[PDB]
């Protein structure tokens, strides 16, 4: 069923493992992800960025998600607005039957970022919906941030960053623990694609051009994980992996044109790449640790 | 509103036009189709092959199809099972809230086709659901088959374009053209150029289809034309932008490719602007018909 981030991350913090979070933008993706988490009996977070919602004129994406909830009802699935900007986006995501929200004001100075966040929190928790925010990275800063806002989780900064191009060639775990300890809440790692090496070579050898493309290498995420980090945001890898396959299939048989003939594989790679990843995140088997609290019951907490 | 195929076509036939029937598999494909029909105030048939439903595990299609219905209220949309075969395939798609179903048993001898269809028609109609069958052809057989089965539409073997009036008139019902693809110089050439390699592929001229529609083809099954157009744009982006790697960045232009290849087709079919023509009767109310 549809699950709160307080909880799914709750059981993550407690049990020293982390849940992978995936930006979805269409069906073949929601499907790739799902096939993986199900195979490894794993909880899952499905992320829809504000670009994903528009890409899919909102409704298709809500609907695709409800298919997953209903196809795999014993698998804790959380649906999560990624990088919220305003409060009205969140009204939007909440309206969509979403059950977690991120409000990203980390580009404002502390007090502004604090205020935006608090306004989102006030709305969401009123509905039982959880809230993730971002800072920076001073441990106290965190402690203030959280105490002053009451969010269910923190995006911390240890020098990852969005996209395929993170470091010129091929991180602070030391900060993740204190932050974890002095805050008592789960932390979150945005920017945690790996550009796995198979993903990359395949895109590159099949007409594509990203001869650079570093990532966070998994060992760093494993390490981070046990030192508090509970939610791991993964986007690029997914994009990359679908694209390699499509390109592969376009070269190896240019007579095919039914998109199903490359999207179907662009899907199965997503799922393959995902599987070791998830596995090292150490969330497998955990899918059925819990009675999943609904949103109305999630209201009690607050 | 979710619409029965009997009605949509009833109007198609009576007012002398066709409704394009469009195969769906995934999100971007439905957005393509929708934007066109909306942009042309056309009724639409969403088609769901049995392949299709398998690729989308049933439940993603049920639900994208459902998003069309709530995003575009004032559009008469009919959800049709394609190229069905078993009674159980209908029984199922009926319960994905489908509104119309084809039972294609036109491989079996004429008598067994009759039995198999009669099987579906008792099912479909009990629920209001509409039913399309297939023969192939020769006009006389077309008459009796309908007489003996009582389907709401009948696909045919036909380019041959004089049977269509005869068959239309002896049966008095909505006919249907399958495998109705044009393979326009441009979607093919867009492909071959950017690295593809299907060169010939034997098109079917839109002019022929228009002429058929006046003879009483009210439903125009299009698949491969839609498929091509997408694989058109994706190859383009792959060449012009080797670096680009986000699905949205090439999956986006495919969707448009679909939209901008349907628009003439629809126009030619003549459902442009008939979308507000009538009050849509619903699966419940429509039991009454039978
Ligand atoms: Zn982020
Ligand atoms: Zn047929």
Swiss-Prot record, chain A:
Q: What happens when the gene is disrupted?
A: RNAi-mediated knockdown is lethal.
Which residues make up the binding site for Zn(2+)? 83, 162, 190
| First-level EC class | lyase
UniProt entry keywords in alphabetical sequence: Glycolysis, Lyase, Metal-binding, Zinc
Pathway assignment reads: Carbohydrate degradation; glycolysis; D-glyceraldehyde 3-phosphate and glycerone phosphate from D-glucose: step 4/4
| Cofactors required | Zn(2+)
GO biological process per UniProt: fructose 1,6-bisphosphate metabolic process; glycolytic process
Binding-site list for beta-D-fructose 1,6-bisphosphate: 49, 162-163, 166, 191, 193, 233, 235-236, 239, 260
Please state the Enzyme Commission number of this protein: 4.1.2.13
The relationship between pH and activity is given as: Optimum pH is 7.5.
* CDD domains in the cross-refs: TBP_aldolase_IIB
The record's GO molecular-function terms, alphabetically, read: fructose-bisphosphate aldolase activity; zinc ion binding
Point out the signal peptide segment: none
PROSITE patterns linked: ALDOLASE_CLASS_II_2
Pfam families given in the database record = F_bP_aldolase (PF01116)
The record describes how the cofactor is bound as: Binds 1 Zn(2+) ion per subunit.
Outline what the protein does.
Answer: Plays a key role in glycolysis by catalyzing the cleavage of fructose 1,6-bisphosphate into dihydroxyacetone phosphate and glyceraldehyde 3-phosphate. Does not cleave D-tagatose-1,6-bisphosphate.
Q: Which PANTHER family match?
A: D-TAGATOSE-1,6-BISPHOSPHATE ALDOLASE, D-TAGATOSE-1,6-BISPHOSPHATE ALDOLASE SUBUNIT GATY-RELATED
How does it associate, per the subunit comment?
Homodimer.
Identify this protein by name: Fructose-bisphosphate aldolase
């Amino acid at each position: 069923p549809l699950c709160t981030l307080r909880q799914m991350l709750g059981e993550a913090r407690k049990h020293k493992y982390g849940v992978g979070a995936f930006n979805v933008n269409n069906m073949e993706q929601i499907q790739g992800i799902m096939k993986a988490v199900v195979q490894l009996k794993s909880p899952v977070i499905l992320q829809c960025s504000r670009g994903a919602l528009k890409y899919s004129d909102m409704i298709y994406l809500k609907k695709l998600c409800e298919a997953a909830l209903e196809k795999h009802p014993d698998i804790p699935i959380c649906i999560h607005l990624d990088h919220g900007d305003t409060l009205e986006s969140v009204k939007m995501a909440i309206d969509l039957g979403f059950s977690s929200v991120m409000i990203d004001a980390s580009h404002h100075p502390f007090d502004e970022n604090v205020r935006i966040t608090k306004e989102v929190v006030a709305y969401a928790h009123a509905r039982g919906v959880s809230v993730e925010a971002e800072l920076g990275t001073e441990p106290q800063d965190a402690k203030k941030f959280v105490e002053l806002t009451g969010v269910d989780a923190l995006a911390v900064a240890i020098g990852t960053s969005h996209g395929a191009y993170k470091f010129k060639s091929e991180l602070a775990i030391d900060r993740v623990k204190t932050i974890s300890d002095l805050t008592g809440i789960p932390l979150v790692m945005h920017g945690s694609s790996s550009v796995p090496k198979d993903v990359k070579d395949m895109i590159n050898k099949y007409g594509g051009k990203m001869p650079d493309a570093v990532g966070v290498p998994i060992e760093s995420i494993v390490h981070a994980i046990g030192e508090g980090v509970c939610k791991i945001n993964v986007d690029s890898d997914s994009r990359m992996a679908m694209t390699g396959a499509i390109r592969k299939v376009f070269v190896e048989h240019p007579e095919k044109f039914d998109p199903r003939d490359y999207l179907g594989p662009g899907r199965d790679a997503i799922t393959e790449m995902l599987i070791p990843k998830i596995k090292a995140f150490g969330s497998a088997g955990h899918a059925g640790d819990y009675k999943v609290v609904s949103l109305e019951e999630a209201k009690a907490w607050y």
